[PDB]
């Protein structure tokens, strides 16, 4: 069916499929392990494969495949890790989060109220910002950043997942009005997400309605800051939520900002 | 005698000199409106004179600390006095002293958790980047030369100006100091860091120094200090200067040690 790529065609007969772990648009996400992920090959690896679910569908999962080819391996993306498309069904192996999406992850993590420390709080921003400001380079635009897109491993890491391919309280408002997406539209999801964070997985403007959040936003009103958050973390998502674009702060100043942060909570 | 300067000129009459700190000297001072509240009074440190060219290095340290500019991780310029007598440098104060007997006072008997320590090493290590953009070379770059603040922020001291154990080859026989010789000092500064502030290569005579850097031999692991530490020291003790890492790849690098314990 598919060409066969040197350099991440991986063997079907060392990928055994496990159980899934939730169906998306472009395709299926399951549970795996693979045998001679790293090339010892006798040491298996858990894993997670993209396939498809019983089309164009196919088109838009090569796409996938193709761009996370293009774009290249950071620490705090989804990696591509290897590819099945010769011997039947095409597989896209990539890395295994094994903690579920960031937004379950701080919701599970909730104490009773009213593990989930300042620090470890500020890392899970900070290394988000590092792989949209990864990505951005890689000239890439997520067009859907939150919570539930930025999955955690076994160790703490935050990986940005879906980069490669309606949730209005996310977006920009040149991208609610005029359908338009820039790195600076991202960047004010980039101040949604924080503000899940430091919220332990809050729903974004709540109790407004959906259909009062465009005027609000068009009047200059923006979400609170939420209780115990320092006033600096909220400064940074006030500044993401400027109505021009180019006020907006860059993911490389974000990246600079919550490394300050980070450092001076670990002085 | 000395220019006015209008962007540091600062008043006597706002700055009050208290108990010297160490000995051209430096003491401590009380200086108000060093913020432009103008009531408001800071602890600050000033450099001068003793009892010369000692003037005229004094003076040359004062103008390179204004070309060199502000960060966070360096001492920096706050003002001068300079018309109506004794020359006066008014610089940040570091009121825990500085980095090595900041780190040997905090002994166990046997505060300074992993994450400081690391936090103390990733600090000098971008305030030396930015000297570094400033194209400015330390040349003394030691635990006893970097100074801690009361909320424990690193700040590099005496970069406006017989050490062998701190000098790179190239400085040691060559008489040679670049910014990747200043790398070779900041790898033994980690080593100080992760020993609470050892003297280096312990046990051995100075004399046998050169001769066992010579031969490939370096110090070894201290104790409890991770691999992927002493890994960064040794890239820092390479003999070649352009194997060494540069203090951007060691900020890089000891970013992520700072991140990788965050989590
Ligand atoms: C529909 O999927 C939406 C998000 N997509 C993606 C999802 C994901 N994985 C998860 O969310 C996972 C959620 N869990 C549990 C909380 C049920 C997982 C468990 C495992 C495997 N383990 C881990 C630990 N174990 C002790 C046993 C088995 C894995 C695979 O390594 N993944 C997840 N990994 C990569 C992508 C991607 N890209
Ligand atoms: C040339 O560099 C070698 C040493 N020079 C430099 C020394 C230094 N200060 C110290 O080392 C200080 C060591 N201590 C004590 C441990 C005795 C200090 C105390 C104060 C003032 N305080 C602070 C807190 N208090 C409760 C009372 C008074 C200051 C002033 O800021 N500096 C030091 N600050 C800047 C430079 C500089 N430059």
């Known amino acids: 069916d598919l060409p066969l790529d040197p350099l991440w065609e991986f063997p079907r007969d060392r990928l055994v499929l496990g159980k899934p772990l939730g169906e998306g648009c472009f395709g299926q996400v399951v549970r795996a392990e693979a045998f001679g992920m790293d090339p010892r090959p006798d040491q298996a690896?858990?894993?997670?494969?993209?396939?498809?679910?019983?089309?164009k569908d196919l088109a838009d999962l090569?796409?996938?495949?193709?761009?996370?080819?293009?774009?290249?391996?950071?620490?705090?993306?989804?990696?591509?890790?290897?590819?099945?498309?010769?011997?039947?069904?095409?597989?896209?192996?990539?890395?295994?989060?094994?903690?579920?999406?960031?937004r379950e992850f701080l919701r599970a993590r909730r104490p009773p109220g009213p593990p989930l420390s300042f620090p470890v709080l500020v890392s899970c921003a900070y290394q988000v910002a590092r792989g949209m400001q990864y990505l951005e380079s890689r000239k890439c635009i997520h067009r859907d950043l939150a919570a539930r897109n930025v999955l955690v491993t076994e160790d703490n890491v935050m990986k940005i997942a879906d980069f490669g391919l309606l949730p209005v309280k996310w977006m920009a408002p040149e991208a609610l009005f005029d359908r338009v997406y820039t790195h600076q539209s991202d960047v004010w999801s980039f101040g949604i997400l924080l503000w899940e964070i430091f919220t332990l997985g809050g729903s974004p403007?709540?109790?407004?309605?959906?259909?009062?959040?465009?005027?609000?936003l068009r009047e200059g009103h923006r979400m609170d800051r939420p209780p115990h958050c320092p006033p600096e973390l909220y400064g940074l998502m006030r500044e993401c939520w400027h109505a021009a674009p180019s006020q907006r702060p860059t993911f490389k100043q974000l990246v600079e900002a919550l490394d300050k942060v980070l450092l001076a909570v670990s002085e």
């Open 45 to 55: 690896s858990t894993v997670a494969v993209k396939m498809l679910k019983d089309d």
């Open 62 to 102: 090569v796409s996938e495949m193709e761009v996370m080819k293009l774009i290249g391996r950071h620490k705090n993306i989804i990696n591509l890790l290897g590819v099945c498309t010769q011997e039947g069904p095409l597989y896209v192996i990539v890395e295994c989060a094994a903690k579920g999406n960031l």
């Open 205 to 216: 403007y709540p109790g407004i309605p959906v259909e009062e959040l465009f005027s609000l």
